[PDB]
Amino acid sequence: GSSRYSKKFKPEIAIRPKVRDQEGRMNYYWTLVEPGDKITFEATGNLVVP
């Protein structure tokens, strides 16, 4: 969450084709934070953190 960005990323589980000999998958994201703003990271798993 932030002052303008908000999205809940529900993890998904499935068998993907092997790329770089690894079964899993990972979606990377980015966002901008204005001066004097707040960004929030709340999760219970399946989250890589900056």
Binding site: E12, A14, I15, P17
Partner: protein, 50 residues
């Protein structure tokens, strides 16, 4: 459709080998009511993956 009295888990793949690109077009049906879930399929909860 639900064969017999179940719709077991489905998993199958295709390996592109015909020296060029290939479109593979599919769909996801969205039945109107839970009775349509119970008739056209078998399990209420279900997931589609590609």
């Amino acid at each position: 459709v639900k064969k017999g009295n179940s719709y077991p888990k489905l998993s199958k793949s295709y390996i592109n080998d015909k020296g060029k690109e290939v479109l593979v077009l599919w769909g996801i049906h969205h039945p109107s009511t839970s009775a349509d879930q119970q008739s056209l399929y078998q399990n209420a909860d279900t997931y589609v993956f590609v």
